[PDB]
């Protein structure tokens, strides 16, 4: 299945720390057997609506192909790190 | 400011109803004075992570240019309709 993986990392990291976080994510995708189809580094962005107390984050977006039964474990592995604040995974298709 | 507007509509609508919802959104963007730079109709998708009781939705994505002081009112106008389940607006830049 094709998925979009949206990651929000700590906005306060220096680029050396961010490089480590990005490397860890890519290694996790490969280690879980995902085929990585696109990586977009969106960078520092701000949630405007709804209203959050901590609206800034460092946004990363991945498009991947992988089996549905492996997605949950991957997502949880990605978010275990303290510098990964949020992970959201959307399947690009549904049964209907 | 440039914003990404992520809309999740009711996944159970027929295309006649969805056409009305899309027309309403575009009219609201124009009526609020946003410049609409891209419209992507992503269609029926499923939240895979985190786990939601109602994970399916009809996803729409807009990129717009508009003043920051008008975004909140626009977002609230967009979501007042029952068929618009979620609106999320992200500013593409931050002060830092």
Swiss-Prot record, chains A, B:
Gene3D superfamilies: 3.30.70.60. Transmembrane segments: none annotated. It comes from the Bacteria. The keyword Plastid does not apply. Pfam families: Ribosomal_S6. GO terms for cellular component: cytoplasm; ribonucleoprotein complex; ribosome. GO terms for molecular function: small ribosomal subunit rRNA binding; structural constituent of ribosome. Keywords: Ribonucleoprotein, Ribosomal protein, RNA-binding, rRNA-binding. GO terms for biological process: translation. InterPro entries: Ribosomal_bS6, Ribosomal_bS6_CS, Ribosomal_bS6_sf, Ribosomal_S6_plastid/chlpt, Transl_elong_EF1B/ribsomal_bS6. Located on the outer edge of the platform on the body of the 30S subunit. PANTHER family: MITOCHONDRIAL 28S RIBOSOMAL PROTEIN S6 (PTHR21011), SMALL RIBOSOMAL SUBUNIT PROTEIN BS6M (PTHR21011:SF1). Part of the 30S ribosomal subunit. Forms a tight heterodimer with protein bS18. May make transient contacts with protein uL2 of the 50S subunit during translation. Belongs to the bacterial ribosomal protein bS6 family. This is Small ribosomal subunit protein bS6. It comes from Thermus thermophilus (strain ATCC 27634 / DSM 579 / HB8).
């Amino acid at each position: 299945m094709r998925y979009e993986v949206n990651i929000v990392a700590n906005p306060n990291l220096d680029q050396s720390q961010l490089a480590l976080e990005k490397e860890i994510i890519q290694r996790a995708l490969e280690n879980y057997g995902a085929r990585v189809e696109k990586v977009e580094e969106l960078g520092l962005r701000r949630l405007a609506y709804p209203i959050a107390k901590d609206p800034q984050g460092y946004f990363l977006w991945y498009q991947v192909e992988m089996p549905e039964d492996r997605v949950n474990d991957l997502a949880r592995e990605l978010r275990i790190r303290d510098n990964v604040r949020r992970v959201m995974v959307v399947a690009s298709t549904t049964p209907g």
